[PDB]
Design a protein around this nucleic acid. Structure first.
Ligand SMILES: [Mg+2]
Ligand SMILES: [Mg+2]
Ligand SMILES: [Mg+2]
Ligand SMILES: [Mg+2]
Ligand SMILES: [Mg+2]
Ligand SMILES: [Mg+2]
Ligand SMILES: [Mg+2]
Lengths: 144, 189, 180, 99, 92
RNA sequence: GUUUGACCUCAAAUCAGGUAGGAGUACCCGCUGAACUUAAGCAUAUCAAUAAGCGGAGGAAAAGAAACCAACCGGGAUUGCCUUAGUAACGGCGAGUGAAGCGGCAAAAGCUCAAAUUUGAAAUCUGGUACCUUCGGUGCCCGAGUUGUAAUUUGGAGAGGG
RNA sequence: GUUCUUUGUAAAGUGCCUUCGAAGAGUCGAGUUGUUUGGGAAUGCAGCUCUAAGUGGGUGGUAAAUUCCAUCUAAAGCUAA
RNA sequence: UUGACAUUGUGAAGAGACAUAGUUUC
């Protein structure tokens, strides 16, 4: 559909477009310049250092962010196979209320809810047989 | 851009996050083969700093090399080239159809050091038509790592300016031959 | 000693190399005609106390000298002026001499238009010969004696003495300052 | 410091008319910019402290900064880098606890 | 002192004597200067431009005043120059 | 939805098109590396960072546009010749060993990335196919690519605004 | 030397003011071992251990500490004679 | 043959240091 626009502009010689902003460097620059209204960050990024600094940067710049599952999902959002990040910067008047409500919902459900728990270490899980052996040892030590 | 953050974080190597990452990645690399193709650079900022571009014709190969001293085959000696150069030469012999551009450290343990090598395809039309990268298609650049023309090769050869590099300024054996030659003219001076 | 007989350089090809160099110069002049075989080089002062009494040819004119002459570095390079970006100007006499050389060169050259008929002219092979390096004059042949009992030997001795004892006097002054 | 005009002594050398060349941009090779200050502060906050940096902080809090400088010189090599590291650790402690 | 390096400010400093001082003037002007020695038209001699570092005083010169420019000079050479009527102007 | 898919990673094909080997090796760039010999006696130096062995190029190779030389009134990529110099220095300062900057000359040539938001439009590119004016061009299509391909800047600077 | 479309309010250069000015990390550097150039402290390279900074860093050929000064801008790359 | 360093991680209990809020040492 881009070619449909270029032919139309050639005949005249177009309104202001609204689109999802994507690209890691572009989105990081938008966050640093405080232009991004909302940021979505994919959780399954390898190497992870590409996005491991994004929540702290968004928190420092006061940009609402949400970690979502699926770089493939963000890629379908931006017409790619994968996308590490997506950003909403400018929205239409028919969707400004929806965007504000979504920002409030993310603030209630993701930022405030996971504020404490994200400061803790993860991966404290044993294997199945090790857990069974530890449970048996604890039961035997507590009661004969 | 995220590359500045990547550079600073990669410098901060003793942090908990980077220690955890290097541990899990060194286990994965030990699971894989000694030399194997890498789907993408593990350090994209470092790769593009060294000259990698994300387009058709650029290849990443991950290689492990054994650490320690050289062993003289006799039934405390030091190799004059680096383990990075050894890794580059082995990867070049593997992918003889390509040209080695550069390489970088990724990980190590007590037994192995781990490097990623960037290679360029001189037959790919994107490279052949790219004016910034078609210099490597010239036949004078065959096996640069084998002749010591990469960054680690020139560092090992001691190719630098100054009084500290008089013996190895432009060729150690070249300047030895130049100095140890008797020069006689037609009218003897 | 070493096996010197395996490395003996005899210059049997001195005359042949001279002929080859003259042939190369003629070939390059024919290919490059009508512009000269050399670029315009500036006048610089030789380093070290042994050679600083002389001027010689440097590598290229500085950006400041080119700008003072009224050209850009790229255009000067295209019209045959050697430009050196790492040499710095700290000597007004040398700066003026190089500006004068650039202005005289611009006056004495003719630059052909990119499009149109060329005014045919014979080529001059040596810009260095056209604009020779001249050692600047230091003083006139004769002057008047103005002696006031200076005792230049004593001046040298006293300068050496004060250089020798500069540090200790400063240390004593620091002690006097720190004493209350 | 103008030249005296003679061949020996302090400020020896020929007297010539001085010029001040324009400053070279390469001389400001290691200048701190706002972008790099922001990035380094954020990266330090995210990544935290090194084990030897934590040991240096403990040594500063429980013992002498001279011993801290000695350990930093052992760990980093040069004494100037040891001084810079100890000053950085003192700034970290002051900005964390006092203000 | 073993392995001593004579590293000074002026490692290059060739010497010249007063008996050879007058050889630095061209022969055409030399006769004219000797014929009409003057205190307001004393010939100026640039020993550094001639390629010398220090002026020594071995010889004897006539009573013609000469202006002598040099980096270094000996006490006797300066005394003889002043006695003949010239002066020593130090240069770098 | 115990389904249907989007990705990631890893495979296969006598899949479409390519590329490497080996020879030569005087000169060139690396690795590796003796002994005969010549002397001394703080258990060595020399021959020699050589012969032999191994790997890799070209018509030249390598080096190369300073994290340089200097301490001057400063010079200004690399290379080679003359020179520095049989000098300083070491040695019954004797035999002998023995450096670099500077100076003259041959030739001269300079430059490119990374790190920036194009965000009012990935502006970039391989391949397939059909035509043509075929060391390539245009249209269409399958793809690569935002985990960043083009333009714009390389420190001598340069960039956004007026 | 003739002829073809002139490209084109496309590209580049230059003056003044104000904001800026991103510049390469298991690298630099240090210890030790082996090797190389050294009369010797100390050079060049490699292995192992430690491991930086941004008014910073390297170098300045007697060893340290303090204050200065001078000169360049590494850890990426191409290039005829 | 012996010792050091790196590879080298995660808990519990008992003794220490900020002067009886948990950041480290044995
Ligand atoms: Mg690919
Ligand atoms: Mg090269
Ligand atoms: Mg051989
Ligand atoms: Mg051939
Ligand atoms: Mg040639
Ligand atoms: Mg070449
Ligand atoms: Mg440069």
């Amino acid at each position: 559909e881009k070619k449909e626009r270029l032919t139309k502009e050639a005949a005249a010689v177009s309104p202001k477009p609204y689109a999802v902003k994507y690209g890691l460097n572009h989105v990081v620059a938008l966050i640093e310049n405080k232009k991004a209204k909302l940021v979505l960050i994919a959780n399954d990024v390898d190497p992870i250092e590409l996005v491991v600094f994004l929540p702290a940067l968004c928190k420092k710049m006061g940009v609402p962010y949400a970690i979502v599952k699926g770089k493939a999902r963000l890629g379908t959002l931006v017409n790619q196979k994968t996308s590490a990040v997506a950003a909403l910067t400018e929205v239409r008047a028919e969707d400004e209320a929806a965007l504000a409500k979504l920002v409030s919902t993310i603030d209630a459900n993701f930022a405030d809810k996971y504020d404490e728990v994200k400061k803790h270490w993860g991966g404290g899980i044993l294997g199945n047989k090790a857990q069974a052996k530890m449970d048996k040892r604890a039961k035997n030590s507590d009661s004969a | 851009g995220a590359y500045k953050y990547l550079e600073e974080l990669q410098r901060k190597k003793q942090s908990d996050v980077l220690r955890f990452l290097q541990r899990v990645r060194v286990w994965e690399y030990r699971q894989k083969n000694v030399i194997h193709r890498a789907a993408r650079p593990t350090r994209p900022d470092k790769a593009r700093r060294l000259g990698y571009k994300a387009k058709q014709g650029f290849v990443i190969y991950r290689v492990r090399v054994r650490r320690g001293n050289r062993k003289r085959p006799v039934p405390e000696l030091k190799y004059q080239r680096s383990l990075r150069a050894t890794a580059e030469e082995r990867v070049g012999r593997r992918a003889a159809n390509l040209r080695v551009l550069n390489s970088y450290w990724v990980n190590q343990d007590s037994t192995y050091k781990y490097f990623e090598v960037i290679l360029v395809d001189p037959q790919h039309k994107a490279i052949r038509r790219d004016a910034r990268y078609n210099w490597i298609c010239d036949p004078v650049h065959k096996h640069r790592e084998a002749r010591g023309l990469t960054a680690t090769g020139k560092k090992s050869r001691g190719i630098n300016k100054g009084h500290k590099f008089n013996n190895t300024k432009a060729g150690r054996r070249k300047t030895w031959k130049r100095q140890n030659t008797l020069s006689l003219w037609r009218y003897r001076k | 000693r070493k096996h010197w007989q395996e490395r003996v350089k005899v210059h049997f090809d001195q005359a042949g190399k001279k002929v080859s160099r003259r042939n190369a110069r003629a070939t390059r002049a024919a290919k490059i005609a009508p512009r000269p075989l050399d670029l315009l080089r500036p006048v610089v002062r030789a380093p070290t106390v042994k050679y600083n009494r002389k001027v010689r040819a440097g590598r290229g004119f500085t950006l400041a000298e080119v700008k003072a002459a009224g050209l850009t570095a790229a255009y000067a390079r295209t019209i045959g002026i050697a430009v050196d970006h790492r040499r710095q100007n700290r000597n007004q006499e040398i700066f003026d001499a190089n500006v004068q050389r650039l202005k005289e060169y611009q006056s004495k050259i003719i630059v052909f238009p990119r499009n149109g008929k060329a005014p045919e002219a014979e080529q001059v092979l040596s810009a260095a010969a056209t604009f020779p390096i001249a050692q600047p004059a230091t003083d006139v042949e004769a002057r008047a004696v103005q002696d006031n009992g200076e005792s230049a030997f004593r001046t040298l001795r006293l300068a050496r003495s004060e250089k020798k004892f500069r540090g200790i006097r400063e240390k004593r002054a620091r002690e006097k300052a720190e004493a209350e | 410091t103008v030249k005296t005009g003679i061949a020996i002594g302090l400020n020896k050398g020929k007297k010539v008319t001085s010029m001040t060349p324009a400053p070279k941009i390469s001389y400001k090779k290691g200048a701190a910019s706002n972008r790099t200050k922001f990035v380094r502060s954020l990266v330090r906050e995210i990544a935290g402290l090194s084990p030897y940096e934590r040991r240096l902080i403990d040594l500063i809090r429980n013992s002498g900064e001279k011993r801290a400088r000695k350990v930093a010189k052992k760990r980093l090599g040069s004494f100037t880098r040891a001084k810079a590291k100890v000053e950085e650790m003192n700034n970290i402690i002051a900005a964390s606890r006092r203000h | 002192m073993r392995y001593f390096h004579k590293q000074q400010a002026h490692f290059w400093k060739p010497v010249l004597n007063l008996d050879k001082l007058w050889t630095l003037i061209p022969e055409d002007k030399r006769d004219q200067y000797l014929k009409s020695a003057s205190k307001e038209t004393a010939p100026v001699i640039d020993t550094l431009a001639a390629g010398y570092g220090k002026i020594l005083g071995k010889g004897r010169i006539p009573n013609v005043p000469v202006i002598v420019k040099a980096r270094f000079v000996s006490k006797l050479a300066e005394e003889k120059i002043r006695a003949a009527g010239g002066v020593v102007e130090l240069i770098a």
